[PDB]
């Protein structure tokens, strides 16, 4: 069945780029008009991991796994947080 407004099965994973940090998570951006929230505990292996989130900065590319979707609001709540191999690149555009 469909959970009132659902696209993805849930627990199906995505890849996104990090944009903000919240009170108990991080916000990750997917595609245009589509953004997610990385829930801090969706891994376990962070806090005692030594790492600044394996260096999860604003404008870095990560992987996330989907939690709460509302097609009505356009919020998919995706949270993973491992990071990519070369997660920072030369982000300038006026060329």
Swiss-Prot record:
Induction: Represses its own translation via the N-terminus (at protein level). Phosphorylated; probably on a serine. It comes from the Bacteria. It is found in: Cytoplasm. Disruption phenotype: Essential, it cannot be deleted. Upon depletion cell growth and total protein synthesis become linear. The modification N6-acetyllysine is found at residue 13. Transmembrane segments: none annotated. Residues 11-81 form the S1 motif domain. Belongs to the bacterial ribosomal protein bS1 family. Part of the 30S ribosomal subunit; the largest protein subunit, it is loosely associated and not always found in ribosomal crystal structures. Does not bind rRNA. Probably requires ribosomal protein uS2 to associate with the 30S subunit. Binds in the junction of the head, platform and main body of the 30S subunit; the N-terminus penetrates the 30S subunit while the C-terminus faces ribosomal protein uS2. Nascent polypeptide chains cross-link this protein in situ. Can be cross-linked to mRNA in the ribosome. The 6 S1 motif domains are not equivalent; the first 2 no longer bind rRNA but instead are involved in protein-ribosome and protein-protein interactions. Binds to the 30S ribosomal subunit via its N-terminal fragment (190 residues, the first 2 S1 motifs) and allows translation by S1-free ribosomes. The same fragment represses its own translation. The first 3 S1 motifs do however bind to mRNA pseudoknots in the 5'-UTR of at least 1 mRNA (rpsO); deletion of S1 motifs 1-3 but not motifs 4-6 is not viable, although a deletion of motifs 4-6 grows slowly and is cold-sensitive. Required for translation of most natural mRNAs except for leaderless mRNA. Binds mRNA upstream of the Shine-Dalgarno (SD) sequence and helps it bind to the 30S ribosomal subunit; acts as an RNA chaperone to unfold structured mRNA on the ribosome but is not essential for mRNAs with strong SDs and little 5'-UTR structure, thus it may help fine-tune which mRNAs that are translated. Unwinds dsRNA by binding to transiently formed ssRNA regions; binds about 10 nucleotides. Has a preference for polypyrimidine tracts. Negatively autoregulates its own translation. It is not clear if it plays a role in trans-translation (a process which rescues stalled ribosomes). Evidence for its role; binds to tmRNA with very high affinity, is required for binding of tmRNA to 30S subunit. Thought to play a role only in translation of the tmRNA in vitro. Evidence against its role; overexpression of whole protein or various S1 fragments inhibits translation, they have no effect on trans-translation, and an in vitro system with S1-less ribosomes performs trans-translation. This is Small ribosomal subunit protein bS1. The chain holds residues 267 to 361 of 557 of the full protein.
């Amino acid at each position: 069945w469909v959970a009132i407004a659902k696209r993805y099965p849930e627990g199906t994973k995505l890849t996104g780029r990090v944009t903000n940090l919240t009170d108990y998570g991080c916000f990750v951006e997917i595609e245009e008009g589509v953004e997610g929230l990385v829930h801090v505990s969706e891994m376990d292996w962070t806090n005692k991991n030594i790492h600044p989130s394996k260096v999860v900065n604003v404008g870095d590319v990560v992987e996330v796994m989907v939690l709460d979707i509302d097609e009505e609001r356009r919020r998919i709540s995706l949270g993973l947080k491992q990071c990519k191999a070369n997660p920072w690149q030369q982000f300038a555009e006026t060329h």
